[PDB]
Amino acid sequence: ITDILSAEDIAAALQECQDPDTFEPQKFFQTSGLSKMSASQVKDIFRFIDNDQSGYLDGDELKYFLQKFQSDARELTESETKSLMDAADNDGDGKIGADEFQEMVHS
Ligand SMILES: [Ca+2]
Ligand SMILES: [Ca+2]
Ligand SMILES: [Ca+2]
C-alpha cells in the first residue's frame, strides 16, 4: 500500500481516526490520498485488503481494514464496520466488490 500511497498521508489518516468510532470512510479516503488515485491503483489497494482473495471484502476483512495500512493500527469497531458496509454495499449481498470499492472511494 506504501508503494501507491505516501507513508506520511497514511500516518495522518490513522492519526485522524485514532479514537474508537472516529473512523469515517470519506475522511480516511481523502486524508490518505486514496480518493485521488486511478482505478487501477484503487484496484491494487483493494487486492491488498481482500485477504482471502475471494474478490470481496466481508467479515473480518473490515475489522482489520486499518491493519492493512499499518500492522499495529487498531481494529475497527462493530459500528465502524457497519458504517463501511452501509457506505459501499449497493446490491444487498453484505460484502464489498471491486466495483463497489471503486465507487465508494471516488465518492
Ligand atoms: Ca475477501
Ligand atoms: Ca505504527
Ligand atoms: Ca455488495
Per-residue DSSP letter, 55 = S
**Do residues 17 and 24 touch, judged by C-beta distance below 8 A?**
yes
Consult the annotation and say whether 24 binds a ligand. no
Domain span including residue 88: 1-107
CA distances from 25 to 22, 49 (A): 10, 15
Helix intervals (H) in the chain: 7-16, 25-31, 39-49, 60-63, 78-88, 98-105
- Cell matching residue 73: 493500527
d(CA 70, CA 78) in angstroms, rounded, equals 20
Consult the annotation and say whether 99 binds a ligand. no
C-alpha 71 to ligand 2 mean position (Å): 7
Declared resolution, Å: 1.9
C-alpha 45 to ligand 2 mean position (Å): 19
Consult the annotation and say whether 95 binds a ligand. yes
Contacts 24+ apart (CB under 8 A), 58-64: 58/94, 58/95, 58/96, 62/96
C-alpha 18 to ligand 2 mean position (Å): 11
Consult the annotation and say whether 93 binds a ligand. yes
d(CA 72, CA 58) in angstroms, rounded, equals 21
Per-residue DSSP letter, 2 = T
CATH code of the domain containing 24: 1.10.238.10
> Which residues are CB-contacts of 97 (< 8 A; sequence separation ≥ 6)?
55, 56, 91
Give the total number of structural domains in the chain: 1
How far is CA 96 from its chain centroid?
A: 10
